[PDB]
Design a protein around this ligand. Structure first.
Ligand SMILES: CC(=O)N[C@H]1[C@@H](O[C@H]2[C@@H](O)[C@@H](CO)O[C@@H](O[C@H]3[C@H](O)[C@@H](O)[C@H](O)O[C@@H]3CO)[C@@H]2O[C@@H]2O[C@@H](C)[C@@H](O)[C@@H](O)[C@@H]2O)O[C@H](CO)[C@H](O)[C@@H]1O
Ligand SMILES: [Ca+2]
Length: 141
């Protein structure tokens, strides 16, 4: 459960996603493994939904600082583009949202500046595109 010395509170928490394809179950983004090669088994994959999304449930509200999202790396890297990262409280009210146009390397790091949330959702805004995430790490700082 550790990354840059900080506790990743998303590790091993319940996850869900819009659908599953190629056995790319949602729990692959919280298994502690950042390997972005889909074929090695640590990357999620939805079907081509309207739109595709993935979510982690921390089970209780917690403070969210950095969110670090590791992309698929073996192929189709541009799929993780034009997406929202969205925080929701215990009643699924939206508490914060950042939009990411694209990634320049293998990850993007967002800072939600200590906002209280239970759910972190990653949502593609382009429908008909599968969502694959190698890992989603969530920190209190
Ligand atoms: C350039 C690059 O690295 N990838 C191309 C390429 O991707 C497909 C090929 O690598 C192909 C070789 O047989 O395998 C495809 O995945 C298959 C899985 O290997 C197989 O287990 C599963 O049952 O079926 C899929 C689909 O045929 C590669 O497709 C990519 O990865 C899969 C997991 C999925 O995300 C798919 O949408 C991807 O395209 O060729 C495709 C042609 O459409 C693209 O040009 C990739 O960028
Ligand atoms: Ca993983």
């Amino acid at each position: 459960k550790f990354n840059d010395g900080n506790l990743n509170i998303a590790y091993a928490k319940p996850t869900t996603q819009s659908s599953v394809d190629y056995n790319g179950d949602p729990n692959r983004a919280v298994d502690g493994n950042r390997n972005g090669n889909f074929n090695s088994g640590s990357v999620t994959h939805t079907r081509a939904d309207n739109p595709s999304w993935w979510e982690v449930d921390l089970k209780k509200m917690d403070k969210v600082g950095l969110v670090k999202i590791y992309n698929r790396t073996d192929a189709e890297t541009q799929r993780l583009s034009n997406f929202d990262v969205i925080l929701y409280d215990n009643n699924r009210n939206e508490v914060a949202k950042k939009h990411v146009n694209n990634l320049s390397g293998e990850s993007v790091s967002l800072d939600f500046k200590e906002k209280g949330a239970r759910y972190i959702k990653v949502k593609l805004l382009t429908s008909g595109v599968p969502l694959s995430l190698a890992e989603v790490e969530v920190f209190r700082e």
